[PDB]
Design a protein around this nucleic acid. Structure first.
Length: 121
RNA sequence: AUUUGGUCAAUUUGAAUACAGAGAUCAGCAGUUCCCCUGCAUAAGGAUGAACCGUU
């Protein structure tokens, strides 16, 4: 974490408060700094010890919520847009396959078959 | 001591597909108004110059 920096929330708010904006837009902007915060602390806001109840699965992902932490949910959705989770998984699988191919004769491997799976796997 | 504040929308329906939802960023130039300078025009208004005599 030596080189890193935040763009601050206040700064962000300021930047987009130089525009022809209806009050709703402004309100949304104001909200956005919380969203980021929520996302940051997501892995210790969204857990069984913190909240309890309908442990729902966010769509297309293994990201279980622990209550509609709505901002958090939104952030998660944004992150994992375009079937991202699936892509990640498949990518990893592909990588593994490649690795296997690279080291066949050393480990005594005949053939390496990527099993065709249900899209939701 | 329990619980509500937790419903994706959209499309195809008579649950399936969707899976968060669909120009950005950098840069010119002109115009708008006011000001200043400059050249020209238009009016007006000066100031001044230029030999030497004139017209029935």
């Amino acid at each position: 974490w030596e080189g890193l920096f935040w763009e601050k929330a206040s700064g962000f708010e300021d930047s987009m408060q130089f525009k022809k904006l209806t009050h709703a837009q402004r309100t949304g902007l104001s909200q956005i700094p919380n969203r980021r915060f929520t996302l940051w602390w997501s892995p210790t806001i969204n857990r069984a010890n913190v909240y309890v109840g309908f442990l729902v699965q966010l769509d297309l992902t293994g990201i279980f919520l622990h209550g509609k932490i709505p901002t958090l949910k939104i952030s998660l959705i944004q992150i994992f847009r375009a079937h991202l989770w699936q892509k990640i998984h498949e990518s990893i699988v592909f990588d593994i396959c490649q690795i296997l191919d690279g080291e066949l004769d050393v480990l005594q491997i005949e053939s390496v078959t990527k099993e065709t799976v249900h899209p939701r796997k």
